[PDB]
Design an enzyme around this catalytic site. Structure first.
Site, mmCIF file in Angstrom:
data_model
loop_
_atom_site.group_PDB
_atom_site.id
_atom_site.type_symbol
_atom_site.label_atom_id
_atom_site.label_comp_id
_atom_site.label_asym_id
_atom_site.label_seq_id
_atom_site.Cartn_x
_atom_site.Cartn_y
_atom_site.Cartn_z
ATOM 1 N N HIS A 2 -32.748 -18.726 0.128
ATOM 2 C CA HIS A 2 -31.404 -19.158 -0.234
ATOM 3 C C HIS A 2 -30.632 -19.431 1.058
ATOM 4 O O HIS A 2 -30.186 -18.496 1.730
ATOM 5 C CB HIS A 2 -30.726 -18.114 -1.110
ATOM 6 N N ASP A 50 -32.485 -22.625 -2.123
ATOM 7 C CA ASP A 50 -31.630 -22.730 -3.302
ATOM 8 C C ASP A 50 -30.168 -22.455 -2.963
ATOM 9 O O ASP A 50 -29.841 -21.779 -1.981
ATOM 10 C CB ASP A 50 -32.049 -21.750 -4.392
HETATM 11 ZN ZN LIG Z 1 -30.145 -20.048 -7.622
#
Ligand SMILES: [Zn+2]
Length: 212
Positions: A167, A21
């Site tokens: 992430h 992400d």
């Molecule tokens: Zn996010």
């Protein structure tokens, strides 16, 4: 697959989906090279403007699409979608679509709500737009920057949970967590595929080309 319904688990046997992400950013090229060197694919839920900007990563975005990783939508600039009107939610999506189709030619049919924040009003906007909504079931907590803890959470959860949330905007995730994740996947002989593939949906359904 249904649209506008939160999806949590892979369903195809032997499969794992490493997902990332909040990119693209300065470490994403590194992450993609690592996956390709190991014969694996990643799923990247990107924003239009957050850490980086789509327009600064066109070659990378093109190879992500052409080499059959999966680009999903993480909205234009990462708001809490439940704190927005239905119209602005839709524009958070189409604004992302319009910028990806201009740079690389495609826009996605998969999304992940920022902060996993969504209710019945967010989901109907996603259903009207035709999106698959991807949650996760293995949270590596990599944003806490505790790499021993993150690597251990991956190892303890990987057997039963195959949609792995990380992430790639964080240097530690790409330089430390990701090599540990790839190595553990190789030890377990799992097929590291895209989220669509891990759900039984092949490349032809991950994108649209014709504008809305
Ligand atoms: Zn996010």
């Amino acid at each position: 697959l249904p649209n506008g319904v939160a999806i949590f688990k892979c369903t195809v046997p032997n499969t794992i989906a490493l997902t990332f992400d909040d990119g693209p950013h300065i470490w994403t090229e590194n992450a993609v090279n690592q996956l390709e060197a190991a014969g694996m694919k990643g799923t990247f839920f990107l924003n239009g403007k957050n850490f980086g900007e789509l327009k600064n990563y066109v070659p990378l975005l093109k190879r992500m699409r052409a080499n059959r990783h999966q680009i999903g939508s993480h909205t234009w600039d990462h708001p809490y979608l439940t704190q927005l009107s239905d119209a602005a939610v839709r524009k958070q999506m189409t604004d992302f679509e319009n910028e990806l189709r201009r740079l690389i030619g495609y826009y996605p049919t998969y999304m992940r709500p920022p902060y996993f924040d969504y209710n019945a009003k967010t989901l109907a906007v996603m259903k009207e737009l035709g999106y698959r909504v991807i949650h996760a079931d293995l949270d590596t907590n990599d944003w806490k920057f505790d790499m021993p803890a993150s690597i251990a959470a991956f190892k303890a959860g990987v057997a039963n949970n195959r949609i792995v949330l990380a992430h790639d905007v964080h240097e530690t995730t790409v330089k430390t967590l990701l090599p540990a994740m790839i190595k553990e996947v190789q030890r377990l002989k799992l097929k590291a595929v895209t989220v669509g593939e891990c759900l039984g949906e092949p490349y032809a359904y991950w994108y649209r080309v014709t504008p809305r």
